[model samples]
Target: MISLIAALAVDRVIGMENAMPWNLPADLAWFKRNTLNKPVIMGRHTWESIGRPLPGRKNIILSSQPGTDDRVTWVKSVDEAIAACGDVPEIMVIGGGRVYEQFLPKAQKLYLTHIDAEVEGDTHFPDYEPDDWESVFSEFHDADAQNSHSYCFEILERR
Candidate 1:
């Protein structure tokens, strides 16, 4: 199974200059909670955006780079990554625009963190047909002094 996880602004902006526009600790925590033990697939740039392998998950990077470590698996293409994930209950696609675009059509589920405010960004989440998915779960959170933005976490399943 494949799922996409992303945090985007109200206007669907996902990133700016290779980074997230807001510092939302809760959203990051939400992501960690859901993907902690899953195999996470991402584009090379997305991996670079994160700077290193995520601590608790298997990082499968789609890149031509030839190498592997205890925590990292470098694949030349998306098919390779899927093959690497073999038999896992689910695999997470955590990425920048291009990577999301590549996986959206085939993704079984979507985990979205919808931030309330819109900020100018260089990268945007790809537009998808609303009818293609059904909302399975949603949780709303209000921004407080510690959290930088008010956001809602939604899990959508392919209809």
Candidate 2:
């Protein structure tokens, strides 16, 4: 399965200064739960933002500059990334906005965390018709001491 996983504001903002604007532990847990065993594909900035290969899965970064190590592999194109992730049960498209916009049309599933509050951001998740997606599952969570904004986790399948 080709799945896109992201935590975006209701306004569809995904990043502020090259990183997530909010600190939401639940969202991190949600991300890890879905991507823990999958091959994850992300753009160079996304990799740079994190600054390391994420633990527990193959981290494939897309970049024109070539670099490969035991832990992380950089590819030049989406086709190369897909080929690098070959035969995985699931391929998770983790992103920095532009990458998500590019893969949105081709993604079969979306693991979206919709934050109730909007904040300053330069990057935004791609716009898509709600009518084109079928909600497979949904769970709501309210903001507490640890989480800043109330949010909902929704798994949507392409319809």
Candidate 3:
């Protein structure tokens, strides 16, 4: 099943002008550790920002428009994306607004980092009622030597 993996502020702001406004080293490390060698789903802009495909993870780009990268699988619909996932145990849904909205319905899990602060942003996570998902596990991590931002890691599963 697809699992969305992202960090957002209290306002659900994810990015500004198609780019992430803040950095959390711990979160980046967490992403690398968790998503390595797995299939990662993102939109064209998110893939473009990274410049090239990340090694170890098989990247899948979701877009309705034509994308330049031939190496990335271009999917138009959530059903198509799921079909692309094949027999893999999990597919990690990375950011870029459109892709996140598309996967929300089918995703079984959400690995979220909810930051204490908010910044103005042009991108957001899809709005869903909190009652829809159960917070299976969560941990508050205060700003420290590793993570410079106050954030909480929440692992949620649909009830």
Score candidate 2 by lDDT.
Answer: 0.89
Candidate 3 residue lDDT tens string, 1-159: 789998898689988876787878888887898799888988888988777888898888877887677777888766777788788998899876778887898889999989876699988889977888999999898998766689988899998
Off by over 4 Å in 1: 67-71
The 10 consecutive residues of candidate 2 with the worst lDDT sum are: 65-74
Q: State each model's CA lDDT, in order.
A: 0.89, 0.89, 0.84
Native-to-model Cα distance after best TM-score fit, residue 12 in candidate 3, in Å: 0.3
Please report the candidate that would top TM-score against the real structure: 2
Over the stretch 1-159, how does candidate 2's per-residue lDDT look in tens digits?
789999889689998888886899989998999999789999988888898888998999888887755578788888888899989878999998888888888889999999998798898999888899999899999999999899999999999
Compared with the true structure, the alpha-carbon lDDT of candidate 3 equals 0.84
Give TM-scores for every candidate, taking all chains together and pairing residue i with residue i.
Answer: 0.94, 0.95, 0.91
Residue 141 lDDT (model 1)? 92
- Which model is ahead, 1 or 2, in terms of TM-score? 2
> Model 1, range 1-159, lDDT digits (tens) per residue?
899999989779998888886888888889999999899998877887888889888888887777655468888888888998879999999987999999999899999999998799988899989999999899999999979789999999999
